[model samples]
Target: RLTELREDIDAILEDPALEGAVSGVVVVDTATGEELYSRDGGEQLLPASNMKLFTAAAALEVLGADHSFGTEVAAESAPGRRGEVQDLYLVGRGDPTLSAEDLDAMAAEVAASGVRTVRGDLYADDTWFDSERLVDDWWPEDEPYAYSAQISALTVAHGERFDTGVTEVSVTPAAEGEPADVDLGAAEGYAELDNRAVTGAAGSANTLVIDRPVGTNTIAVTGSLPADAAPVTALRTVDEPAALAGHLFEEALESNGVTVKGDVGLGGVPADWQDAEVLADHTSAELSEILVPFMKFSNNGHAEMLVKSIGQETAGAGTWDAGLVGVEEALSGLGVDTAGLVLNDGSGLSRGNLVTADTVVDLLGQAGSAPWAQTWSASLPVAGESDPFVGGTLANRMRGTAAEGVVEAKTGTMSGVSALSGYVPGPEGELAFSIVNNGHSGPAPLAVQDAIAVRLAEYAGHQAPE
Candidate 1:
């Protein structure tokens, strides 16, 4: 029975459409640890976003789904008669889901908790994670993209958008020959904007370019847009997420009727940190809830945060190196070959990451057999699903086909890599699969992956999809 299906998969794998690409495929029986089919399954290749598969699995196995991150507002001294406290300390435990609005709500809670004035500096304590913002292998050029946003123990999000570390910048063409209207969704403090865009003739090409210089918050907007064009916007992650968090939190405090006597700054939480009083605290949704977005959308920031959190919990430090060690230990317990895996960072943005299809299959089988299998599996994006929060990155692909809604898997993409690995419900039983394709360029690789999924979805015994 497996022989026939393997032939069907081989047809797609050998198709001239993906001739130049290297492929790794693995299929297994969920009930029994059976490797029914495999090709180049042991060879390491760039997994791209597929690396999140390991991060998510380790996070659940090590941290448990019930774990929640807490952001606290603490002070060295107690509140005075006039509701004044000195030197507020903002402590973070690496919550990626935290938003500016969430900070605003936290400020409201602080105001309601009888804190009117902060007599001393608003010191942000990001000591939970190391000062190393970017991973070692991630290309420095990708730093400006929100996808490569710096990881912070304490960070601020522009809104509820999954693209953290950056806010939206919109450019609307005005009357022809007039300067275009530019709007930075941010308030005033986090970033500086230099607008060099102008309104061109109607129907003209959009030459607008928005960029944030590396290691700085200066956003340079150049080029022009047609007068008749709709608003165009771009997302750019900030250089210092911790500083962004501090400013936004201060704004929230002021808006909520709280006054600060000093400036916003960053500092470490001292040994006497326990002596501080809690004025406001924000507790994030549990890991179970966060996994949906983290896995569905393949949010890099969330992956980084969980990596650090796992490290902080299991080991003593919160750096990526420490967190990756924790991940290896967790995965090793699952019987995965720790020696074969190369996890440079939690997010697969690093080209240095390499993993085998065999390791991915082993992890999947282990995750399935674990007590938290249901929660972990359900977090994967379902093909043809519509809701961004639910279908996530897989939401738009494989629709109206056998694989649509039938294939629940993690989708991956990079310059030369495209991968889809997870389960496909079939007439026989549940099928665990891992397909990693590297060196392929363009949409051809994606179409092949979809074809492979459709064939698997239509399987019934030895029968294959026509």
Candidate 2:
């Protein structure tokens, strides 16, 4: 009933193919849901970012494709002074797509509404959900990088601190509008800043260093980025999400004729602020486009934000406990018995989360046809296409000779884990597949995983799988 595309796959796996890389590859007929090829298909392995496929589907299904989390700025309409005396309150509903641009637009709209400075005070309600300033538990040291950061509804600029100027010559502030006059102080030898901050707002006498960690940080950022490219604001997401967001919001208020007397930080709306009425609402860009940054870029904050949004939207809580429940519920609706699933966080930044390969494949099947399926698949890296034999070794190899736009999927990797999940058209033609590799010890055991997928892709180009 199925095509045997094994010999092709076997040839690649034979010699020096993948000596030490532990992998699991499965191909499914999108139309019939048939498993054509399986190498340890039932085995559970670390899925890396491939795990996001499950989280995204669960989110889109439960949260709806058109759904966008809204952050509201409301006025209580209480007594204060002037024609209007109200406290400015902002309650965020966890919109992952909210950005500095969006905030600027919103600020313009607020300025148009006719308000001049706050009579009472300013409060970032943040009460729409729980008060967890950061995510469940992430390494504080990674705060400078977007990938290893926290999640909050009041976040922006891909959740990173915004900066101006060039990368090495750039003068990134602690936060956007962090007062160009404020002291950048001495370089703490940070890797992200690159000591690029200059003295003045225009250019600087001294450069501020945002170094992540000298040797390794340089390798990761440059290795991943095109050479000599002027680094923009931290693209890692969450490098200064909240700060960037606040600046945009402030800019918006300023444009709209409203000015804030306070700053942005963790916690709830102030008790003394007057009520601010909700004037307008905003929806994020789209689940599909947004996921490009979410999955492909492996943005932890964006991923977690969506999951938390899924939680607050479904279970009335944004905390991990509630978000996990929503994820499980959505998966169960897809007929997945999550008996063996242990999802610690939506971003999979934590090793505490454990899942079986079968479960991952099952989720892939469900996500393949879902409305948000296209969005989910489009965010993946390819084999031998763009990434190096290192970062996305799987991409460069698998992208060989396939029909244009063939392999649209997500890939995942961490320490000992390597994974690939997406649609592959080959001998069997047009199928959803997931290959997971775990339990390997070495620098690039993933190269073996990438190699296996490459061989599989070639098999598809020639004959059908049996």
Candidate 3:
């Protein structure tokens, strides 16, 4: 009877236009792990952003839900006679959970530690992290894109902004305001700002595209942002560990009534003691909450920093290669088969990353009953019922909105492939089901997949649609 039912449904999948399609689905009791529907569920199918499940699960197991990759700012060089320091360095320890305030606090802390002034050049030890950015084999089309932005120990929001959504809280402004507030505080960089913005406020925002280079620190003011916006808009939210370390050092120093004469920069910070006393410490929880948002939102810079930290932690190296080692080690221990799982960075911006639906599904199962599980699952979209993906072909001829409150899933897409995976609730008398569709080449697979969901819903308990 089961074979007949599935085969009967199989015919519905036969579309001549689709180039190819692969699905791996398993419907289990979220309570008992019972198999409700199995159609090549064990076979490997390309799973796109579903890969994030692995990342979330890995972080949960390795760092634990309560853990935080705390951002650190320490001074390794002492002040010499007459404030002539031999050498001083600021280092970023690869904390993805860190924030702008956290960075500010860190900087102030360093100043409060005393010694007041240094006579040596400042260096940011972003070197702990191998600067080889850009995923190993990502598509060129994917680069320069917001999600495809570069990863540095010291970075801000994958290099740009979301622009229109509440998520886009900050924007860059044009100007030569207040005579550049040239405090003795400074950092080494090569970009110059040319503010040609008109005095009047922005009439209307056309779009929120950021036109700038990936490695550049200065946020360009090419597009218009609402004038009545926040007192000071944000163009990029710095998530870089290296840059952040410097920021925090300065913030922490100032808070403790410390003053710094040297500027901020990147280099190596050798192990050494401080000339001043400690003033304060920033809690890991503060950084943790922000990391949760980054993880939930699948923030690329957050993931990238985590990966680098893993590398730096395990092999005393903070490059992407080391991070890949840490991520895979964590995933492998969790029983996830990482074959062909070539990860260049924590974020799956790499086209070289090849994952299977089975891996994603296995991760979903492993994360069961864990704190990170809920956070990770919640991070994924609820199938085809939200935002840009809410009303497209994926949502065509079907219904999975929270209005009915029965759908939960994740989606991933790249040049020629689109994939959707997750569970559809089984109501009072039916079994919950898992569905996956990959390589929808024969016509619009989303429509085909939605048709399946509707049919399954009807099979469960709902009235059949005409």
Candidate 4:
């Protein structure tokens, strides 16, 4: 049966669709690191978002599953009579989950702390991490995209309804032949908008384009919309997350009855900041809780943030260099060979990342029994599952097939790279595998990966369901 299975997979790999594509595959028995099959699995291939698996695992090992990011509000001096503070500081600890509502709550807490007035400047202290906002070697073209949002120890979401460190914009059609209305999800103070969109006649073509120039907050809207069309929206990444967060915090303070007599600026907390008492604090969901979307949506920002975080927590420096070192160490501890693996960034957004199919399966097999295995495995998206918490990037994939809802895997994709790696249950037990292909055009690589996953599901001599 095993030999037959190998032949079946070879046939699929040789299909015309996969022709000319560099392919790799490795399957291992879940109970042990026993290789069930292999095909060019030793060659390094671009893992794309599959790199998140490595980043996520290393973070779990170094930061502990229950660890959470924190944001703190403190006063330079204990509040004086009638609610006054010498200086107010918002300290960020890389809480990517922080939102405007959370900041508002913090502001209320500050007011409750009896700080109605701040005599000194309101400082945004993002010193927890270095000043490097984006990873080196990232494609300049991707910078304006949300997947490449700026990274900051201090960040903000448009509101509680949204995740941390994100913003959005909306464009709605106006009366026939009138200019369209454009609105931004972020606070207006953070970015300037120029609505160059006009409404065309009903049933006419509707095209919308939203752009925020690199290094600036001017979001330009250019295009046209049909007057009868529904509103269109685009999620945008903020340029300077820390500064925007500070401004939002300032607004929160004013809204919560706290008065700020000075301006807001970015800097490190004073070395003597400990002399001040903490007024309020917000802690993000545990690391385990964050792994869900971090893996499901292939959130590049989350993955990069986790890398810097792991670096900071493990090597005392929040940087890709330190973080990659920490990741190698953590994987080594988990029995994954670090040799021949090229890790550039946490999100796998960089073209420099390289790994083998063997490495992915080895990590998956080892994680099945690790202390944090349950949470780690649960982070992968289940095939054909619709819930974002469960399905993620695979929500619409592999449906009505043997792998549907039975396979949990991490998906990877780029211009020329494609990968699917994770676990699948069979009649006998679970099987861990990796299938990666590069240099393919169109959806051929994905189809091959899905076929391979389906074959894995049909193992144990059980007939694959129709």
Off by over 4 Å in 3: 1-35, 38-46, 76-89, 140-143, 154-191, 194-210, 213-259, 271-281, 286-291, 312-316, 337-345, 369-404, 424-466
Alpha carbon deviation, residue 83, candidate 1 (Å): 2.0
Model 1 alpha-carbon drift over 4 Å, by segment: 272-274, 460-466
- Tens-digit lDDT string for candidate 2 (178-211): 3222222211122233232322333333333344
Residues 140-236, candidate 3: write the lDDT tens digits: 5444344655566554221121110001223443332211111111221332333333322545443333333345544343434444333333333
lDDT of 1: 0.83
Weakest 10 consecutive residues of candidate 2 by summed lDDT: 161-170
Cα RMSDs, all models: 2.2, 7.6, 7.0, 1.9
Off by over 4 Å in 2: 1-4, 7-21, 30-34, 78-86, 133-137, 159-244, 255-257, 262-276, 371-400, 462-466
Can you write out model 1's per-residue Cα lDDT over 1-466, one digit (the tens) per residue? 6788889888888876576788889988786667778999988998888999999889998999898988998877667778888788778878878887788888998888788998888888888998888887788778878789888898875555555677777888888877777776763566887878889898898898888777778877888899888899777777677877788888889999999889887897678666777878888899998888788888898898889988998987898889999999999987677767998888888899999998888888888888889889889998887888778887888887787777889988888887889998776768889999987656638778888777778773323323
Global lDDT scores for all candidate models:
0.83, 0.57, 0.50, 0.83
* Pick by lDDT: 2 or 3, better one: 2
Error of 3 at 379 (Å): 4.7
lDDT of 4 by residue, 1-466 (tens): 7788889998989877665788889998877657788999899989999999899989999999999999999887668777888777899988767888899999999998888887788888888878887778887667667788888888775443234455778889989768898887764777788778899888998777888776677788888899889999877776778887888888999999888889888977778655768999998899889788788888887888888898898878978889889999999998888776899999888889999998888888778879999999888999888886788899988888878878999999988899999998877778999998888876647888888888888784334345
The whole-model C-alpha lDDT of candidate 3 against the native structure comes to 0.50
